Design a protein around this ligand. Sequence first.
Ligand SMILES: Nc1ncnc2c1ncn2[C@@H]1O[C@H](COP(=O)(O)OP(=O)(O)OP(=O)(O)O)[C@@H](O)[C@H]1O
Ligand SMILES: Nc1ncnc2c1ncn2[C@@H]1O[C@H](COP(=O)(O)OP(=O)(O)OP(=O)(O)O)[C@@H](O)[C@H]1O
Ligand SMILES: Nc1ncnc2c1ncn2[C@@H]1O[C@H](COP(=O)(O)OP(=O)(O)OP(=O)(O)O)[C@@H](O)[C@H]1O
Ligand SMILES: [Mg+2]
Ligand SMILES: [Mg+2]
Ligand SMILES: [Mg+2]
Lengths: 552, 556, 552
Amino acid sequence: TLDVAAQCFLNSLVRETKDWRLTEYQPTQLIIPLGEQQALHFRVAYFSPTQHHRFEFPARLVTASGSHPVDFATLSRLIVDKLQHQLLLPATSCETFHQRVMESHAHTQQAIDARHDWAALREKALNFGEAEQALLVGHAFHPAPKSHEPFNQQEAERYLPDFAPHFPLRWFAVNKTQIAGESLHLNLQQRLTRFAAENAPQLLNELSDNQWLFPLHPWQGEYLLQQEWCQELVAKGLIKDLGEAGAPWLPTTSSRSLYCATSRDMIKFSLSVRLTNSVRTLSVKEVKRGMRLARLAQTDDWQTLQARFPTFRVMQEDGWAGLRDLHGNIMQESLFALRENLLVDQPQSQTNVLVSLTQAAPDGGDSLLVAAVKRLSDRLGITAQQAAHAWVDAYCHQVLKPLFTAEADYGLVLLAHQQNILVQMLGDLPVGLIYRDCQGSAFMPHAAGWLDTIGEAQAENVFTREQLLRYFPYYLLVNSTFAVTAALGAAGLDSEANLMARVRTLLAEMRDQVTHKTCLNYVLENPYWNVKGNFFCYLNDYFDFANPLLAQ
Amino acid sequence: TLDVAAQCFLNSLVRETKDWRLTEYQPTQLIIPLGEQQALHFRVAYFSPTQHHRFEFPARLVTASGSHPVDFATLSRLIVDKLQHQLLLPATSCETFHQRVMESHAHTQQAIDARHDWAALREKALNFGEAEQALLVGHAFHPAPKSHEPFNQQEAERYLPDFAPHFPLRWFAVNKTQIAGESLHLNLQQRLTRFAAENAPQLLNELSDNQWLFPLHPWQGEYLLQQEWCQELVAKGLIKDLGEAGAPWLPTTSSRSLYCATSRDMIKFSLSVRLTNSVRTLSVKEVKRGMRLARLAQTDDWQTLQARFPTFRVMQEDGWAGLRDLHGNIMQESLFALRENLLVDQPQSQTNVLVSLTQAAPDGGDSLLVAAVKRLSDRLGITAQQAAHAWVDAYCHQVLKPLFTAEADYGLVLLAHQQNILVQMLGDLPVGLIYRDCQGSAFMPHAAGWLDTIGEAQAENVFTREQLLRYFPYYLLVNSTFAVTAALGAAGLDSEANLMARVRTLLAEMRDQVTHKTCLNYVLENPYWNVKGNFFCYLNDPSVIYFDFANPLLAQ
Amino acid sequence: TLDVAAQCFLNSLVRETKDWRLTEYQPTQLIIPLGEQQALHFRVAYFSPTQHHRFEFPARLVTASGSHPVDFATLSRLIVDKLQHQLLLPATSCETFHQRVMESHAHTQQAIDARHDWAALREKALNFGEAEQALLVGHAFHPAPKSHEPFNQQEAERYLPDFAPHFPLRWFAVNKTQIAGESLHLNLQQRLTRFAAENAPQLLNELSDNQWLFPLHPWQGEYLLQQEWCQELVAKGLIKDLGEAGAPWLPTTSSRSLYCATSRDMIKFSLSVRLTNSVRTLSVKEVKRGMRLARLAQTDDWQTLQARFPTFRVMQEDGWAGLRDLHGNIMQESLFALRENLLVDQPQSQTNVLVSLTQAAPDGGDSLLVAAVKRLSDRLGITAQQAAHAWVDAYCHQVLKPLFTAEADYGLVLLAHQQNILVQMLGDLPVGLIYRDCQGSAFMPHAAGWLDTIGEAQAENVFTREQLLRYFPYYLLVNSTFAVTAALGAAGLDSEANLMARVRTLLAEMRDQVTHKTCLNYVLENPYWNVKGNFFCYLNDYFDFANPLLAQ
Ligand SMILES: Nc1ncnc2c1ncn2[C@@H]1O[C@H](COP(=O)(O)OP(=O)(O)OP(=O)(O)O)[C@@H](O)[C@H]1O
Ligand SMILES: Nc1ncnc2c1ncn2[C@@H]1O[C@H](COP(=O)(O)OP(=O)(O)OP(=O)(O)O)[C@@H](O)[C@H]1O
Ligand SMILES: Nc1ncnc2c1ncn2[C@@H]1O[C@H](COP(=O)(O)OP(=O)(O)OP(=O)(O)O)[C@@H](O)[C@H]1O
Ligand SMILES: [Mg+2]
Ligand SMILES: [Mg+2]
Ligand SMILES: [Mg+2]
């Protein structure tokens, strides 16, 4: 009756198309014409003004003769055929698209079947690791959010968060000639030594002045070792495989970022896998973004920002390393970034990634957000609606405020979608924010003088005003705030319209306080936002979105 | 050199008198004239515009063509003698006052010598229980904050928090015909069942339809049991003494209130002991106030208030019980009230009573507040002054905001001591408030329509305007907020003057958002605050009992 | 290649028959003749003198015409067809037998597939709850150890240990007139009061002098509510259904017994479900046995026993309750027994039920027992064989000594198979015993004087010498000790023969210390043991066994 994987495909499509209808009569049905006098009739259980819809399955294909049910595989192929014919697309690109969609759908079902614990997650507050592996639906507005090529099923069970696995890292003993890297506070030799001593102490027999301990992802590790350039190093004895060892690491929502509860650092690997339309290798350019922001976090003006927003943290990526071939070429498939584990002293703190809270429950029950809101209602003795309002209000103050204000007053841009936002909670109420993913950092023109303080003002990741107004509202509101409000709306705690009214009101107060009102004005006043459409972007290996926050 | 006990006697005095002077020369000294061409000279290490002074000892007697040092016992006797002449005081009350001040001074020194763990508390964030037993100085502006009467040494070691003790409760099996009480959600029979079950399960072999388990304070219980009316019940078989049993309980800052980390309920006993000019027995009257507030907490307007401030909690005292004699008369010395333990599900949270944090270190080191702020600074990588400002700003938003708004918008008066304020912290930053002691709850006239909804419009704890303006700014700014700013000022993180400017700014923002501006107007604009002193109140078990306090928040 | 469910069926068969043979030539194959020049050949991977075999699959059916592979569904039909005519087995009975064998085989594979966390159990010492849900194979010598009629697949996932579920209890508020029961230390009213106050505190609003809180199994409670007699109680106002509430409970290896870490009591329910040829309802007679032993556990001679074996405890079932119909008749289907939770103060102790340790790994890897012995080896820096020896010797001293001695010196009989034996470990070495299930408690004639001290010398569960010698060695050696020695043997730590020699040598030393040597003499000297045919027993809704503990 329900299929959260199919809903992704359909909500992604409905958001990015103007061609679909609603029936005047009840029960309401959404209609996607296929042309040639036939159309798909979806029964609507919940209609969302932000297109967080929920359809009651199976769908029905309507014909001249009559009507008949169709499975997802069928209705999806009829849609890709339609788009191929009306929009005149290539054939080889449309079939590969449909194949990848079906793989994802199928992979989402296996993970649902495998995870019998998921429902029990509603029962109490989740820690960091629990939330990082609770996301089974994936990207709610991507057609194929769970494609993981080239991984097989055995590899997808060990190396993806979906099956809640854990594993020790792989380790090499590498000569320092063949180690490139960079790190703050501790030099590179000192990070690697600390990181090794706290995770795989028994390998410290291999540690010397020249021969350092190098961590690798177990899949990449085996994938790198076979390569000739790496095998050449083994021949010269500049690399020595130590195998797997040490503490348990669990893949996070991004799969390539790993978490260990006792390690002062998390580790983000260059991982040769396609995950929603991008191979997840790292570049030297990318890791220097993190190093850039990490150094900027030492300045006085950062000190001032942090003082003003003490409940707001950024998990700095202040270290990285990678292997050099025999020529000295940094092999980017061996790179990794080291990310501050700000939860190391509090591994049971209710700090959750937002995307896991807002995803629709695969069993059609409460979302993990709604669970938390319901606990908050019970604990405080207030109505579920009142608990919905308070949660939403605190979310604005704790999450949105520092993020808009970081741009407006300091020119710092943090592109914070659901998977980058960690909601620090205490008793299911947001009391802070931790931002993650420093590749999502950028700088406005009015941060240039501040960047000069570290010599970076010619930074690669500098945005123009037009770049800001494109990305920033989509990530923070469309791809964040409206999932919060939609999830609460789908559960019936309050209408999305009324909840977005609370968001609007608080964004207005926020505007009054900041210096550069450019962005908040665009958000609060401009009729149409740029929104990145994954449905047609993924089909090829941008649209205007009606702004709901305008004054009515 | 250091005496935090003497500083209480002296600072309390300096606040309630205008008969003292500073030296135009340095090192600066504070002078208290004794008349007859003699005076006491105190070396001032820190001068506070909120009278949180730090004197360097010994003092010095300035007399005849010369002086000499005087111990605390001497200078205090001299000052009490001065007061006996000035106010024509009965000699019996003077000597009772002085002996009590020495008792407190001595008891404090004992505790300080007994608590070698105290300095180590600076090392990390405190849990609720740790903070509740970390107060060794007591009331900072009371002359005898550690008077224990009639506790002996052994009794003070076990039943006060100072030595960080714990003990299981005493228990009576009592016929329901001799149990008077009340409870919400669960009836009285059901509370005592739950409470007895989760605290002393092994006594459930004495639980029946008619015979209920009844908890007692080990010291009160031994006293009540030696009474005539109680033994009538033992002879009648309506009371059986089961002795001590069950989980460990910690006396908190108030001594009569106990804490058990695994207990869903705290318990606040009627305790026949004198602590800062009040016998600590309960009355049916006072325990009804808790019920009144608890029943009011089920209303939709409370619900509305709670929604507006989700991080603000009140620990509801929604249950109480006591013993009645054979004639059915409630014996107030047996009373207790049950308080919600909102920390039962996280006993290791950084929820601390404010008074323990602000308290000046007995060893002269960092106060526990300064230890926190310093951790806040190091974690966030910000300056100690930036951490101090951040902590103070969050204190205003998390503590002062809900309390001033509850009175203004809803008419609810919560008289928040430094001891009734639990600061819910997360990473050494205030992120919420938990208020304790419902005996200090009162209602303004404009709460009347709301009290009607539960039929308590004629509540005894109703306050006039003048009552509010006297009490509320004393408890919540003088005996609370200024202790925060003073602690940080004394540590040299920023001047009290500057920190009090921050509070004013935020208090002024708030006034613009409330309905009844009556209270915040007074705070910000009334030149003087007329309140009640502890030093001359304690000396007398009316122009002196209450004194005018120069407002430091006036735009100057 | 590996099928642990099929191995239960086949080993159970080979143990209870003398019609099969072994091929001299290598690779060795076990042959089960079907007659008519037709037979099944099983490639043996491990031959066990205690019939804990491991066959390599698929099996191969051999005729004069040739050989071809056969799957488990086939070879099991062929074997039942054989047995059907060889025993003149009724056709309708045999069809039901094989249907339950395929159901068991199927449900097992579903559980293996569902439990992706099982392999990870090898990594560290298990706690009690983890072990209680680690048994996915079931009884290793029952033909259908995972048949759970009438449970459907949804009901199995929630109410059997197999999917590691947990849930809150169902609760009725019941007039004390309709409550039957008994308890020690606390009376019945007081136990139920305590049991409710620590497990479902929020239901205490319903508690009163006349209306008592009454716990139910979530399945059994619904099954009960629908019956006519219970409806009458609801109509009369004698019962009020409070629904589900309270702390989490996890079903143990027995399913009808539930475990809550925070509760001083475990609860054993009358459960109308068939688990290995026995519907799991309780009877009044059966819960008297627990009360009887509990009262006997308060005597001075029990004291004398306990002081001699301080590491040995029994989990006393010192309470029970049940509903009565309107006529005062105790309803057998509503019964439950309360059991001491002796682990309530150390929930993370390495106290594991033996059966989950000995069980063959579904994925063919190390057993959870061998996982421990290897930890023990690595910790002490001794050889795996030495650790195996130490573990076995420690098993004999901590488990076998107190149990034999209890019969010999006191006349107390505890029928301790693997599932009643909780091995108390410290650093993967046994250091104690906790016995469970007082239904398997009995008494010898020389215990009669001790029984007279509580007036229970007339007990129903008194054994004859013959009853003792039949049951005791099977449960306590065949279905306990030999699974340990066979798991260590199959792992290649040492031969079963050498490990069984260690057991004999210690049993010999034991016999010299006890007064009544009857039992140990029968174990050490009698050429044959009586043993249960769970196979032909299950076929029909026992047999002699060669003693390996003989001196040779
Ligand atoms: N709503 C969402 N928005 C963005 N990403 C999502 C969403 N839902 C799921 N995801 C998943 O999260 C990942 C986001 O990738 P992104 O590049 O932001 O992180 P990363 O750099 O790979 O890892 P990290 O965040 O640890 O640095 C994708 O792989 C995507 O499948
Ligand atoms: N700064 C302070 N202000 C007020 N009281 C203080 C202070 N420091 C310590 N105390 C102690 O705390 C107690 C407060 O008395 P109060 O009547 O306000 O609370 P209570 O009702 O006794 O305690 P509870 O909070 O358990 O209800 C006094 O005994 C006093 O000695
Ligand atoms: N090797 C084994 N020996 C005995 N029982 C086993 C074995 N393996 C699994 N089991 C399971 O253990 C249960 C044994 O039943 P038994 O009557 O001894 O326990 P019970 O009385 O139902 O439960 P409890 O032990 O909780 O009192 C059966 O349900 C059976 O499926
Ligand atoms: Mg990311
Ligand atoms: Mg108080
Ligand atoms: Mg059993």
